[PDB]
Amino acid sequence: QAQRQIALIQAEEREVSARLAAAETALGESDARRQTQDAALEDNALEIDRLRNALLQSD
Amino acid sequence: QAQRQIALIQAEEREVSARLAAAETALGESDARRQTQDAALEDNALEIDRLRNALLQSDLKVSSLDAS
Amino acid sequence: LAKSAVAQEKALKRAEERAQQLRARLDAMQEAQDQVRRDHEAKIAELQATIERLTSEAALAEGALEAARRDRSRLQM
Amino acid sequence: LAKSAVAQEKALKRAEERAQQLRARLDAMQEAQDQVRRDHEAKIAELQATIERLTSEAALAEGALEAARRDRSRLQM
Amino acid sequence: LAKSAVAQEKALKRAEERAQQLRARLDAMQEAQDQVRRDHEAKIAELQATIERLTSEAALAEGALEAARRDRSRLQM
Amino acid sequence: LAKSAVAQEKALKRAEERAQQLRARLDAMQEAQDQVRRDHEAKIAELQATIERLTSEAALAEGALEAARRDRSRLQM
Amino acid sequence: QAQRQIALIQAEEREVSARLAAAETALGESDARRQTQDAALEDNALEIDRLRNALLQSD
Amino acid sequence: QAQRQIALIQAEEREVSARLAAAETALGESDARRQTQDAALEDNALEIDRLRNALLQSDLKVSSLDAS
Amino acid sequence: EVQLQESGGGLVYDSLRLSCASSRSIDGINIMRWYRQAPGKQRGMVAVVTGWGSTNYVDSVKGRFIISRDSAKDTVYLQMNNLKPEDTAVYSCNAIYRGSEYWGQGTQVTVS
Amino acid sequence: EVQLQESGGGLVYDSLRLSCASSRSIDGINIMRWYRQAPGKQRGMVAVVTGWGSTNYVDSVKGRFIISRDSAKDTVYLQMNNLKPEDTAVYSCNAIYRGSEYWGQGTQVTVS
Amino acid sequence: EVQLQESGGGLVYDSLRLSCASSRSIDGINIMRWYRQAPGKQRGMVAVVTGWGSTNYVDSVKGRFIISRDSAKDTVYLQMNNLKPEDTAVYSCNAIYRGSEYWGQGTQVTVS
Amino acid sequence: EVQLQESGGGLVYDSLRLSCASSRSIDGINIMRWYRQAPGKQRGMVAVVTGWGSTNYVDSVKGRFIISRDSAKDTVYLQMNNLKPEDTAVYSCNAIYRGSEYWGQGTQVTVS
């Protein structure tokens, strides 16, 4: 029965390590890009806010 | 020893509902918010183009009229 | 497409560090065979000799020392 | 430049399988050591045991060839 | 038969010194194989790697650097 | 005692063949080294030579790939 | 031709070493025993020389 | 080198007519002298026994006569 | 000098081989290799093997062209499988003994 | 525990064998050996072999009795050749696993 | 792991020298080579030394560079004289141990 | 070649000790053993130690001798107490390296 509990412990930890490895790399970069995409899109979000005034001045 | 490998299993199961789940629960956070900003970028592009082109559409009167 | 072009440029540069970072552990732990087991094979050979001589030494010590001894103690005859 | 991301998409993809493929060999080499690390635990004992009661026969067999060898001197001389 | 009996007694004692005296040179010069040639086998393996990589390094250096270079200098077309 | 020389004649004879037999193996092991000591003289050269004009091709082949590569910068930029 | 002269040099020296080895061991001990056999036999050579007087005194 | 192995051969042939022969010539010395003393030992034993036994043969008169 | 009287190629569309035989020196084999060339251009190698079972390929001939050894005959086996249209070329095997390189004929392989 | 169901002997005057078979442990073979004994006396070995091809003999059985291994069946081969008159005896093979020694029957060889 | 160490930077209008030392795995060196890098451009060999110290270079420096070794101290040297302002590049010595390559920091040589 | 070194001589009517040290090939020791020699008589084992330090002796000294090792210093020890004047002999420690045996000078132990 010692081999029985052991048989899972390498089996489980490998599945455990996989989800520790995968989720950590899954979350990280996509988090880095999301904040940039927020920065990327919200800075030229005022671009429409600047031009809507520029449209109304002359129209 | 065999029982201290038995003790690990519960704590190992504690670690997955712990950090393991925290990572999973954070996954739903990003993709949900990603779709909000991703879909908005199309809409924000849609809102920009109508008045960026109208800028060109409406301004054109600045020069043509001045001939008069 | 400046931020998209730049993004992939910094994107690749980390996975190519993992390329070394995962062949770093591989190079080390692979050396854990080339010497640890290879000498571990030698000690078996070293311990192997003693099972060759305790048989040779007892070869004279069991037969010859009893082919004549119990012959010599045949005083019962 | 417009397609230059397309080329840089594949290095972002190819380097991913070099991460995927390589860790598999890291998976294998671990039990290529651990299972052997259970084999070189039994071999020493199973080999050392067949010696640890070989000296106990190299000696006790001489007990008959020394406790009874003290008798020959009574008559040989 | 005292001098004849004694003569053989001192006679054997020198040839049994040659028994060691001729297995002395044998034990030494036989060790001149177990390390001198065995490591001499290793240096061949050590030098053997460089003929594996100069082919691998030139594998990219000869084909790829000429599959596109002479393609690039097709300005004659 | 009368026959005791007869027994001691054979050790004077047996130790003689142990001298005779053993020197024969000393005869053999000498050319078991010398002839091999001519084999491990040619192998190094025949192996090192096939490298000493491999770097002379790893370089001169790049001469075409560097003396002609200076021309692409005139038009690519 | 270098191998030709060499072919004899190991061939000759081995035959040479054999007769250096054999003759040296052949001569030596037989010389040691001969001087002893001289000593062994010449000391009781006077044994007859002593008794020939002892015979003549009484006879 | 090959010629200095050639030079050795003559000197090697000089060494055999030298010490090599000195040992051979000494071999005839011992066996010749060995046979002289070996054969003599039989003769010296032959010369001893005739007068060692005559010692017993002739002395016997010392005691038997004294009875008279 | 070797006589690498090579052969095995063809001029077709399904499964081919490049077998470079021997004439002397049964596995006196140090570095030995192959070359191809396209007309109007100079030479180039295809795949190279070394007497230690180590084999490496240039990028193109991967997955379709296979090189393997056979010391029992001294005839390097360079199988031509999955002959793609680009594989049209002129080929020739190679070897190096004593330092002085040696060459042979080779043949013309044209598959489209 | 092994079952060394040994056999092969005989009771004659020309060429015999002592073959000690196996029951388990195909070359789980550490030190393993043979014993003989003459009636009215206790036991004694004849020849011993070890799993490393090293073989040694007691003085008597030299030149006439030969011991050799066969791992493909786990049946030590102890050939009985040139059966001299003294070779009359009672024999039995031996082995040692886990430390705890094991024995069998053996047979009676009587050649005069 | 193994380490390298470069040296030899300098400018003139003409006296100059380079050196590339190592502190570990000393003389355990099969083929090792030298490189130069054009700014913002690729990288290629310039000079090499080997086990037997044979002499051969890249065609650009025939009659220009002389390269020599010390087995003990592990610092190979090159002779740079009669420079032409067009030889300037970024240099980084090279070495291959056990079949694996090993680069160092890298330096430049400029004349102008 | 390898060397040994004995020690431990002494007399009483009762306190006594023995030691057998070595200066080379330290701890490179498989089975090594101890002996005693009766004057003008033969030689035989008395006590042994091995790789695992297992305890076993000759029947004459069951409950009489205690033997113990130091792996580092290479000097095995024996416990000699409650002596009987009939144990006197000539002692010489033993060791077998690489399968070959190696004797030393030899000493005696006397009580009377």
Numbering used by the authors:
A (entry chain L), G (entry chain F): 96 to 154
B (entry chain K), H (entry chain E): 96 to 163
C (entry chain H), D (entry chain G), E (entry chain B), F (entry chain A): 367 to 443
I (entry chain C), J (entry chain I), K (entry chain D), L (entry chain J): 1 to 13, 789 to 887
Article excerpt on this structure:
Crescentin is a coiled coil protein that is required for the crescent cell shape of bacteria such as Caulobacter crescentus. Crescentin shares biochemical and cytoskeletal properties with intermediate filament (IF) proteins, which form the third major class of cytoskeletal proteins in eukaryotes. To better understand the relationship between crescentin and IF proteins, and the filaments they form, we have determined the three-dimensional structure of crescentin filaments by cryo-EM. This revealed the full-length structure of the parallel coiled coil dimer of crescentin and how dimers come together laterally and longitudinally, to form a non-polar, octameric filament.
Among the MBs, megabody 13 (MB13), a derivative of nanobody 13 (NB13) binds to both CreSwt and CreSsat at pH 8. Cryo-EM analysis revealed that for both versions of CreS, purified CreS-MB13 complex at pH 8 polymerizes into regular, unbundled filaments upon lowering the pH to 6.5 in the presence of detergents, such as CHAPS. For cryo-EM structure determination of CreS, we treated nodes as single particles, using a box size of ~420 Å (henceforth referred to as “small box”), to obtain well-resolved reconstructions of CreS bound with NB13 molecules. Because the megabody bound close to the C terminus of crescentin and all N- and C-terminal ends in the crescentin filament are located in close proximity, this enabled us to obtain a reliable structure of that part at close to 3.3 Å resolution. In the presence of MB13, CreSwt, and CreSsat similarly assemble into a “supertwist”-like filament, where two intertwined strands, I and II, are related by a two-fold axis perpendicular to the filament axis. The resulting atomic models of CreSsat and NB13 allowed for interpretation of CreSwt maps, determined at lower resolutions (4.36 Å to 5.78 Å). The atomic structure of CreSwt resembles that of CreSsat, with only minor differences in regions near and following the stutter. The structures of the WT and SAT versions are very similar, except that the SAT version is slightly longer because the helices contain one almost complete extra helical turn.
